């Protein structure tokens, strides 16, 4: 949208150093998981920058020019995840979305862990229900069809046939 466009111009021009871009543009995933990740991870639309100072500069820029608002991730705040990304045992060995993200920049990988955490992806709602509702741990689960079981236990879905609307 207009907001991301404006920020990207500040990056490309070099006026605001330190901008990386929209988080979802900074990694890749197998197309099989496109609906899942788009449905469950709004943080993919956050804008990654090097530091809190750069974030504040972008916030100030957007406001000064009546452009709008965005949410920012500063890589400087992501280092807390450095030792927290190792694979874990999951119900039915269901994949963790985070582990499916392909990215070479290790700082950006930390941002992906912040965004996705231990969200799992299940093949269908049948499996999602088995996986989510463990006695010892409520897992956040998204299906390949974009249905979501939140840790609270709510279950969301419907009108999947319009996911690919033009």
């Amino acid at each position: 949208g207009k907001v991301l466009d404006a920020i990207i111009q500040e990056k490309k021009s070099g006026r605001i150093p330190g901008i990386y871009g929209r988080l979802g543009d900074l990694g890749a995933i197998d197309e099989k998981y496109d609906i899942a990740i788009s449905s469950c991870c709004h943080a993919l639309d956050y804008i990654v920058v090097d530091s809190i100072d750069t974030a504040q500069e972008c916030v100030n820029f957007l406001k000064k020019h009546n452009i709008g608002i965005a949410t920012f991730i500063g890589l400087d705040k992501m280092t807390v995840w450095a030792k927290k990304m190792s694979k874990i045992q999951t119900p039915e060995n269901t994949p963790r979305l985070f582990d499916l993200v392909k990215v070479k920049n290790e700082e950006i990988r930390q941002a992906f862990y912040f965004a996705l955490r231990d969200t799992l992806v299940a093949n269908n709602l049948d499996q999602a229900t088995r996986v989510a509702y463990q006695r010892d741990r409520r897992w956040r689960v998204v299906t390949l069809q974009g249905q979501i079981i939140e840790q609270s236990g709510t279950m969301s879905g419907g009108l999947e046939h319009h996911h690919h609307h033009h």
Binding site: Y133, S152, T154, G157
Partner: protein, 155 residues
Amino acid sequence: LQFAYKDPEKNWNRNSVKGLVASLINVKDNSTATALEVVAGERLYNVVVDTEVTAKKLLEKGELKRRYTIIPLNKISARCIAPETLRVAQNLVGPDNVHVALSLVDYKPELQKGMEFVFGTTFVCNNMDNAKKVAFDKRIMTRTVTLGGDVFDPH
């Protein structure tokens, strides 16, 4: 407007579907409705059902007309405001001036866990000064809504 669906299968027990949250609550005092609406937000249009099996069958076979979020009573698990947190809040701004939102609504007892999820995790305060005091207190750190409908959320 009621929740509408196609029976997911034969011999469907309609009692398994309770309906939209908004249709299941009775506000105790109309002067708190503005606050409660803000507390619930889009959760007013979550659908309450008995179990995760019923939820799954509706989502898959109910021919639902939009994306719905369903609250299955047998699995829903709120992270509620604890009694100690309320005690601290009351001592901070006065017991007349802060309530757990849940205490402001009536509903059938079978719905308890669903209502704890919608209303049991937010405070309602009389005014902005008190709402800010409660919400951001290091001992409380809990979303708070004023009777005027303003929101203060430490997160």
